[PDB]
Amino acid sequence: KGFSDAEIRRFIKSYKKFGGPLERLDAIARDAELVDKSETDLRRLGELVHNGCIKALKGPTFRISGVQVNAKLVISHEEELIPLHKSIPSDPEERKQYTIPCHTKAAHFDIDWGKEDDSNLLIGIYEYGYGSWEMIKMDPDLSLTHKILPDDPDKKPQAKQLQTRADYLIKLLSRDLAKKEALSGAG
Amino acid sequence: KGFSDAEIRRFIKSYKKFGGPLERLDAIARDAELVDKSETDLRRLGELVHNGCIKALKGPTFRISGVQVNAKLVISHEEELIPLHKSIPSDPEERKQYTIPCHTKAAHFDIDWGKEDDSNLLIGIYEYGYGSWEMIKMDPDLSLTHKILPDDPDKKPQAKQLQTRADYLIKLLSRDLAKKEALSGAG
């Protein structure tokens, strides 16, 4: 493939940060510093990762050029993101307005952190990938630039607090999806 | 006097930041970058400012070497600080434990800012002078280092918010002192 082993490794690290990654190849390329690559080359590599995991899991490993891919690890990351993929709108206008529909416990960032901040953190994780805290901070529309990752390393929320909060919010989404499925009677 | 006109001017700027300044000559010297000066030289200059204001106000101006001192301006600053001078303990152990005894309205710093933060801001103003926000931030015991003057200029409280808050708290102290004088019947 028209990629180096180092480029394949960056692609796989970024692929693991999203749900439905084959529909997020430009966000993956941006995150993996592969913006220069063609849409056809990105689609080909993404489908090698997607199809490789299916073949290995129908732990198990597979190769992409000289890179060894842990199929269980990719899919464990994808499973953790299922509630986010199912909850956040794919439509951009709708996504901008997304609000978490359930009550959230206090964040304890020693700051004002409310429902809209939780909502924008989840939109940022959808847009930039799980763990892409600097990219979410740099987004000029999510209103987190002057809230997250303070310059002062003793002030919250730093990456640790964002990871804790994000994991809590994604678990809340999982519980909410199950409750809505049970209440509606629609599987 | 054993001081330059530039040194006299720094001394007067720092003198205006305290109540009972003649009892705060070391804090004045620290603030005015005059730490090198002897206690006798500092006392002599301070008494020239104190006695000069009395003579001019028994606007009116007086001279210290080649420096023109506005007596009304010095005394207006000293009057604004009367409630702070009368409320904060002069004893160091007691001062460390000082808590504002009345209810304070919300600060709107978009952070957690409570009674102890207001109290420590007032102790810092007493110790370092009105407007000495960086010195108060640098104090390792007042617990404001990671709260005030954020590195991010869009985050609060910056100097503007500290000035607004301090003026509000000193007015609250003035009202509290008058109420306690009326309630006790002791002038």
Side-chain angles (χ1 to χ4, degrees), chain A residues 2-34 36-43 45-54 56-62 64-67 69-71 73-109 111-174 176-178 180-187, chain B residues 2-34 36-43 45-54 56-62 64-67 69-71 73-109 111-174 176-178 180-187:
Chain A
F3 287 91
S4 76
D5 280 6
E7 287 170 331
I8 305 281
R9 293 179 182 273
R10 297 205 308 274
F11 181 88
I12 294 159
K13 188 177 193 182
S14 292
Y15 185 104
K16 286 177 186 175
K17 300 184 164 182
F18 298 90
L22 293 184
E23 296 174 312
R24 311 303 311 284
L25 296 165
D26 293 343
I28 285 165
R30 170 177 61 198
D31 194 62
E33 299 87 40
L34 300 173
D36 66 288
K37 306 296 176 178
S38 75
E39 288 271 25
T40 293
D41 282 10
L42 292 175
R43 195 190 161 111
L45 179 48
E47 294 186 1
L48 288 174
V49 178
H50 180 272
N51 292 330
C53 288
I54 291 160
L57 300 173
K58 192 167 183 285
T61 57
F62 68 95
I64 303 164
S65 291
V67 182
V69 186
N70 185 334
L73 197 45
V74 174
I75 299 303
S76 69
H77 283 288
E78 294 292 308
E79 287 169 326
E80 288 162 356
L81 293 171
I82 285 172
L84 187 73
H85 186 221
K86 286 176 81 185
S87 300
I88 306 293
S90 58
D91 176 69
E93 180 279 314
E94 199 74 13
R95 178 164 61 251
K96 192 176 193 296
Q97 303 304 321
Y98 172 83
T99 301
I100 183 154
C102 44
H103 173 73
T104 66
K105 73 186 183 188
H108 294 126
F109 294 163
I111 73 177
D112 298 12
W113 184 272
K115 185 163 246 49
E116 190 54 36
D117 300 319
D118 280 321
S119 299
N120 282 336
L121 182 61
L122 292 176
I123 295 161
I125 288 167
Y126 177 102
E127 289 178 349
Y128 297 104
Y130 180 97
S132 302
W133 315 123
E134 187 65 31
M135 289 293 288
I136 294 169
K137 182 182 173 75
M138 288 180 178
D139 183 289
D141 298 308
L142 289 174
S143 297
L144 294 175
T145 308
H146 300 108
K147 301 192 181 63
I148 70 171
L149 308 180
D151 295 320
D152 181 340
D154 292 316
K155 295 179 76 181
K156 295 172 183 174
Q158 296 295 345
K160 175 59 170 174
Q161 291 77 42
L162 296 174
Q163 177 186 84
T164 296
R165 190 60 177 185
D167 294 349
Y168 162 71
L169 294 173
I170 292 166
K171 188 177 195 177
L172 278 192
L173 291 178
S174 185
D176 199 57
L177 287 167
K180 276 165 177 162
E181 290 165 4
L183 285 166
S184 66
Chain B
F3 287 91
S4 76
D5 280 6
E7 287 170 331
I8 305 281
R9 293 179 182 273
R10 297 205 308 274
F11 181 88
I12 294 159
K13 188 177 193 182
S14 292
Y15 185 104
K16 286 177 186 175
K17 300 184 164 182
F18 298 90
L22 293 184
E23 296 174 312
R24 311 303 311 284
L25 296 165
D26 293 343
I28 285 165
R30 170 177 61 198
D31 194 62
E33 299 87 40
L34 300 173
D36 66 288
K37 306 296 176 178
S38 75
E39 288 271 25
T40 293
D41 282 10
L42 292 175
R43 195 190 161 111
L45 179 48
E47 294 186 1
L48 288 174
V49 178
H50 180 272
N51 292 330
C53 288
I54 291 160
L57 300 173
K58 192 167 183 285
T61 57
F62 68 95
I64 303 164
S65 291
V67 182
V69 186
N70 185 334
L73 197 45
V74 174
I75 299 303
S76 69
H77 283 288
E78 294 292 308
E79 287 169 326
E80 288 162 356
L81 293 171
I82 285 172
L84 187 73
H85 186 221
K86 286 176 81 185
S87 300
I88 306 293
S90 58
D91 176 69
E93 180 279 314
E94 199 74 13
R95 178 164 61 251
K96 192 176 193 296
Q97 303 304 321
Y98 172 83
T99 301
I100 183 154
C102 44
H103 173 73
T104 66
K105 73 186 183 188
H108 294 126
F109 294 163
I111 73 177
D112 298 12
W113 184 272
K115 185 163 246 49
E116 190 54 36
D117 300 319
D118 280 321
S119 299
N120 282 336
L121 182 61
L122 292 176
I123 295 161
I125 288 167
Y126 177 102
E127 289 178 349
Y128 297 104
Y130 180 97
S132 302
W133 315 123
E134 187 65 31
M135 289 293 288
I136 294 169
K137 182 182 173 75
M138 288 180 178
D139 183 289
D141 298 308
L142 289 174
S143 297
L144 294 175
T145 308
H146 300 108
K147 301 192 181 63
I148 70 171
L149 308 180
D151 295 320
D152 181 340
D154 292 316
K155 295 179 76 181
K156 295 172 183 174
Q158 296 295 345
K160 175 59 170 174
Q161 291 77 42
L162 296 174
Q163 177 186 84
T164 296
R165 190 60 177 185
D167 294 349
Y168 162 71
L169 294 173
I170 292 166
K171 188 177 195 177
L172 278 192
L173 291 178
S174 185
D176 199 57
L177 287 167
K180 276 165 177 162
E181 290 165 4
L183 285 166
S184 66

